[PDB]
Structure 1
Amino acid sequence: DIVLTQSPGTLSLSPGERATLSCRASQSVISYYVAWYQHKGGQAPRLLIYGASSRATGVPDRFSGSGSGTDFTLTISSLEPEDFALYYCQYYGSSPLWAFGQGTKVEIKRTVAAPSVFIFPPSDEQLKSGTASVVCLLNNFYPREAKVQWKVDNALQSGNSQESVTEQDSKDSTYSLSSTLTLSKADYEKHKVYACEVTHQGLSSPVTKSFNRG
């Protein structure tokens, strides 16, 4: 089966720079059936380029297409505020009948901002129910890459924590992340000190925020 591999997975650029998005195909393909699509979250995909190089109606000319054989390119000449979204390449005719790329995200490049870490102990209502969720918050940082390590009584925890990240803030282009360690009340009172350890390239050294039950 055909495989379309876009690169990079995430393209980080400031407003007003050339964005060069790439799409590489498993096999050699006919350019006439390569298409590009923009996808913002709040709406349906938007056809940008078809036939490798034809620009669809309503597309504002900074978007261009080129490519041949196995390597195809979508280019935005001057990134504008609305141009930061997901982009997908597409090939019709092989197997699957319509093949898609995994998508490239273009984001706003920013100065590096360090996360401001906060730890939240479990509420007593939650304990009265039988489960404990301790929440660690990483606020207003860039870039998005951040490592959260949950340690209980100085023991590394794996498999008991889900993460969730906000989308880039429209004003200051920062991210925020929350890690939720979920433990049963029984295991919660087994151990005393609870800590999340944050490593981000904006921090001078890995920051740890902790608490002791009570």
Structure 2
Amino acid sequence: DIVLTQSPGTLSLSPGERATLSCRASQSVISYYVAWYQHKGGQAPRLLIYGASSRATGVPDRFSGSGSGTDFTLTISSLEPEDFALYYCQYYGSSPLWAFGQGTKVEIKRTVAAPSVFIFPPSDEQLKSGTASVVCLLNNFYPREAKVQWKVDNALQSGNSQESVTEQDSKDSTYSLSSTLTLSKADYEKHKVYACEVTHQGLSSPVTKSFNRG
């Protein structure tokens, strides 16, 4: 089956810069069947480039199509706030009939920001049910690449927590994360000290926020 490789998977720029989105195919495909799309999470995807080079109606002149053989490129001359979204390349004719790329993410490049870490103990109203939840808030940081580790009595726990990342803000252009550590009320009383270890690129040393039960 044909494999569409979109590079890079994450892209950081600013309005007015040149975006060079690539798309690699496993087989020497036909240029005439390559197409590019812009996907906004709120609505349906929009066709930008069809036939590798042709621009669809309503697509601004800044978008451009290029490529031949196995290397195809979508290039935006100068960026705009509306252009910051996801982009997909496609090819029709091989297996599967409609091949789709991975997903090139276009985000605004904010100056590096440090996450404001907060830890939340499980509420007593929740422990009455029979299950505890430990929330570790990471607020307003850049970039999105951040790692959260859970240490229970200075002992790491893996797989028992769930992360959640918000989208880049409209004004400050930062991200936020909320890793929720879920444990049983019987096992939450089995321990005493709980902490989440935050490691970010904009951190000189890994910050750890903790709390003692009771």
Same fold by TM-score, threshold 0.5 exceeded? yes
TM score, norm. by length of structure 1: 0.99
- Helix, strand or coil: the match of 2:188? helix
Distance (Å, rounded) in 2 between the aligned partners of 1:64 and 1:104: 16
* CA drift at 1:89: 0.1
Distance (Å, rounded) in 1 between the aligned partners of 2:65 and 2:191: 58
**Where in structure 1 do 4 or more consecutive aligned residues deviate above 3 Å?**
none
Q: Deviation digits for residues 99-128 of structure 1, max 9, x if unmatched?
A: 000111111111000000000000001110
Distance (Å, rounded) in 2 between the aligned partners of 1:103 and 1:151: 34
- Helix, strand or coil: the match of 1:22? strand
Distance (Å, rounded) in 2 between the aligned partners of 1:103 and 1:64: 18
Q: Deviation digits for residues 20-49 of structure 1, max 9, x if unmatched?
A: 000000100110000000001111000000
Distance (Å, rounded) in 1 between the aligned partners of 2:163 and 2:137: 10
Distance (Å, rounded) in 2 between the aligned partners of 1:65 and 1:11: 18
Distance (Å, rounded) in 2 between the aligned partners of 1:92 and 1:48: 16
1:147 and 2:147 matched: yes
- Indicate the residue corresponding to 2:74 in structure 1: 74
In structure 2, runs of 5+ residues without a counterpart are none
Distance (Å, rounded) in 2 between the aligned partners of 1:204 and 1:69: 45
Distance (Å, rounded) in 1 between the aligned partners of 2:129 and 2:13: 47
Distance (Å, rounded) in 2 between the aligned partners of 1:177 and 1:61: 37
* CA drift at 1:3: 0.9
Distance (Å, rounded) in 2 between the aligned partners of 1:77 and 1:9: 19
* CA drift at 1:11: 0.8
- Helix, strand or coil: the match of 2:157? coil
- Helix, strand or coil: the match of 1:84? coil
Distance (Å, rounded) in 2 between the aligned partners of 1:205 and 1:3: 40
* CA drift at 1:14: 1.3
Distance (Å, rounded) in 2 between the aligned partners of 1:182 and 1:173: 30
- Helix, strand or coil: the match of 1:90? strand
TM score, norm. by length of structure 2: 0.99
1:132 and 2:124 matched: no
Q: Deviation digits for residues 183-206 of structure 1, max 9, x if unmatched?
A: 000110011000001011112211
Distance (Å, rounded) in 1 between the aligned partners of 2:103 and 2:123: 40
- Helix, strand or coil: the match of 2:171? coil
Distance (Å, rounded) in 1 between the aligned partners of 2:147 and 2:24: 30
Distance (Å, rounded) in 1 between the aligned partners of 2:98 and 2:157: 42
Distance (Å, rounded) in 2 between the aligned partners of 1:100 and 1:201: 32
- Indicate the residue corresponding to 1:180 in structure 2: 180
* CA drift at 1:72: 0.2
Structure 1 range deviating more: 197-206 or 45-54:
197-206
Distance (Å, rounded) in 1 between the aligned partners of 2:179 and 2:138: 8
Distance (Å, rounded) in 2 between the aligned partners of 1:145 and 1:53: 34
1:100 and 2:112 matched: no
- Helix, strand or coil: the match of 1:129? coil
Distance (Å, rounded) in 1 between the aligned partners of 2:193 and 2:80: 47
Q: Deviation digits for residues 38-75 of structure 1, max 9, x if unmatched?
A: 00111100000001000110111111010001000000
In structure 1, runs of 5+ residues without a counterpart are none
Structure 1 range deviating more: 195-204 or 135-144:
195-204
